[PDB]
């Protein structure tokens, strides 16, 4: 069937759609199609292209109200401007200076504000099941289902640790801590990465 209405979606509405590049772009919802119990959403993008997308690959073009976001919520976020999919790992609280922690689909982690988030329209019941990278997906499943149980290592600036990267362990130094993230300076290449403090990549007890 072709539909004009589907839940709160309406043909002609402004929307964000996922492109093959994995970045998300503004468009218009031009069709809603049912195929058995399945639903597809045709989007005409503002610049280039039409795509027929599943509901987990479109997002509303507005910012979610804070109380509609949970740990595990599936979102599109400003990735640092590009828009990229992720999972909410933390909601605003005193310890994170009232920000959202996002774990992006490629494994990048960043704190963002509500103004940098868009809610996915039809997330999967298990929101992580459309994360393409299996390693990332498994990590998110464990994190979201274990929450609020979050084993983390307590790190302090100046601390020398080993950190994993590309399958090996690198001499490194804790530069800064920001909520549940730690900025690690890798001594070999003198470059930094922000890493979640519950990451098994962090080894203080070498």
């Amino acid at each position: 069937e072709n539909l004009y209405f589907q839940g709160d979606l309406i043909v002609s509405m402004r929307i964000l759609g996922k492109k093959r590049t994995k970045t998300w772009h503004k468009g218009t919802l031009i069709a809603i199609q049912t195929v058995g119990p399945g639903k597809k959403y045709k989007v005409k993008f503002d610049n280039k292209g039409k795509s027929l997308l599943s509901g987990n690959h479109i997002a509303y073009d507005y910012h979610p109200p804070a109380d509609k976001l949970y740990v595990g919520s599936r979102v599109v976020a400003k990735y640092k401007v590009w828009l990229y999919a992720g999972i909410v790992a933390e909601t605003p609280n005193v310890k994170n200076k009232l920000r959202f922690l996002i774990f992006f689909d490629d494994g990048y982690a960043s704190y963002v504000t509500q103004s940098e988030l868009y809610p996915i329209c039809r997330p999967l019941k298990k929101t992580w099941e459309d994360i393409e990278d299996i390693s990332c997906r498994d990590f998110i499943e464990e994190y979201v289902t274990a929450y609020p149980n979050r084993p983390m290592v307590l790190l302090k600036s100046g601390q020398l640790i080993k950190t994993e990267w590309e399958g090996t362990w690198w001499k490194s130094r804790v530069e800064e801590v920001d909520g549940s993230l730690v900025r690690i300076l890798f001594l070999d290449d003198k470059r930094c990465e922000w890493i979640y403090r519950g990451s098994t990549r962090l080894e203080p007890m070498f």
Binding site: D106, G107, A109, E164, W165, D189, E193, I195
Partner: peptide, 4 residues
């Protein structure tokens, strides 16, 4: 440099 990639995340990770």
């Amino acid at each position: 440099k990639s995340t990770x």
